[PDB]
Design a protein around this ligand. Structure first.
Ligand SMILES: CCc1nc(N)nc(N)c1-c1ccc2c(c1)N(CCCOC)C(=O)C(C)(C)O2
Ligand SMILES: *[C@@H]1O[C@H](CO)[C@@H](O)[C@H](O)[C@H]1NC(C)=O
Length: 333
């Protein structure tokens, strides 16, 4: 199965899923950086303005609903949500599965008021599942219907003319329509996390970063490519970028000239061009242009680690292989 995704400003990719009977629809990010499923709850206080602006699941209108009520809290690098657990049938592009998910009752304004999506479908391993809840992908696998134990991500580049798909996720394989060349696989450091060994990061012609090795989390639920505050400070220093509050900028007229940035993964260099990491919204020397690379310190056990988000996946079609515990990259078509 494949789910069509919508691209919002190159920072938010989400698709649709139905929960309950009749199906209550929700926009959700398919996140390889987490393992739980959650959507805003009708029990969410309207004092949380974010709940006023999103679709809310109402168990009272679902005949297939299954109570549980176990409380849980989901911690993301840029925000937290609280709620309780519930069970119901979830429709994911053709596949129907009974799933345990979280009904969020606490959705902080910053950042959720800025989310185009309603919730999250975690594609991570159960090992990282808060509350030891069986992940939706594991449950789908249990049905023995997927042609293969893998799922793929295609994140397109933004577009001013809704007619071009913003992206697509395939359950059970990869769509040859959106990649060329052959996949180059990299074995997972450890099962339980979509993290791999990164052999080095280079800026221009000189591997000035991640020498001796480092970690790379391949996060489909993250907007950018991130590294420890230390690493980025060094990286951004080379690009001549000014550190702001939440991002790093560069004078727009300088964006096009910025050097290539490479990532040494599984014995192949994955190179990004300025056009790939800079939000070139102007050429003016009187305007600032944001970089699609940020500083973000991920805490243990997962961190310290670099994170390969949408900035990376836009260029490289990504396949996640549960069967062989490996990640695959290929030039996105
Ligand atoms: C998905 C859930 C998620 N998963 C992971 N592993 N990391 C995150 N930082 C987020 C996460 C949380 C809140 C967010 C966003 C992401 N994103 C990025 C969406 C990425 O889409 C591919 C946002 O834009 C705003 C609204 C700030 O709020
Ligand atoms: C919620 O589901 C878990 C999963 O097995 C179960 O152990 C727990 O008792 C459930 N909570 C209740 C009381 O419904």
């Amino acid at each position: 199965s494949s789910v069509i995704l919508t691209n919002y400003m190159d920072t938010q990719y989400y698709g649709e899923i139905g929960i309950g009977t009749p199906p209550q629809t929700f926009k959700v990010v398919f996140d390889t950086g987490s393992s739980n499923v959650w959507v805003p709850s009708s029990k969410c206080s309207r004092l949380y303005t974010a709940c006023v602006y999103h679709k809310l699941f109402d168990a009272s209108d679902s005949s297939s609903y299954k109570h549980n009520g176990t409380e849980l809290t989901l911690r993301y690098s840029t925000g937290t949500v609280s709620g309780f657990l519930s069970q119901d049938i979830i429709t994911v592009g053709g596949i129907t599965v009974t799933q345990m998910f979280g009904e969020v009752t606490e959705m902080p304004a910053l950042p959720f008021m800025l989310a185009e999506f309603d919730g999250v479908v975690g594609m991570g391993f159960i090992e990282q599942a808060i509350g030891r809840v069986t992940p939706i992908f594991d449950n789908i696998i249990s049905q023995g219907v997927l042609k293969e134990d893998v799922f793929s991500f295609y994140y397109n580049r933004d577009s001013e003319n809704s007619q071009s798909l913003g992206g697509q996720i395939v359950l059970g394989g990869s769509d040859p329509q959106h990649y060329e060349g052959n996949f180059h696989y990299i074995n997972l450091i450890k099962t339980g996390v979509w993290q791999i060994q990164m052999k080095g990061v280079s800026v221009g012609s000189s591997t000035l970063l991640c020498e001796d090795g480092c970690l790379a989390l391949v996060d489909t639920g993250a907007s950018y490519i991130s590294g420890s505050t230390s690493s980025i400070e060094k990286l951004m220093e080379a690009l001549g970028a000014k550190k702001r509050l939440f991002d790093y900028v560069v004078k727009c007229n300088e964006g096009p000239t910025l050097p290539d940035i490479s990532f040494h993964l599984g014995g192949k260099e994955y190179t990004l061009t300025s056009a790939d990491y800079v939000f070139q919204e102007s050429y003016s020397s009187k305007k600032l242009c944001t970089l699609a690379i940020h500083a973000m310190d991920i805490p243990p056990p997962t961190g310290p680690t670099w994170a390969l988000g949408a900035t990376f996946i836009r260029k490289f079609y990504t396949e996640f292989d549960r069967r062989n515990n490996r990640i695959g990259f290929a030039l996105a078509r």
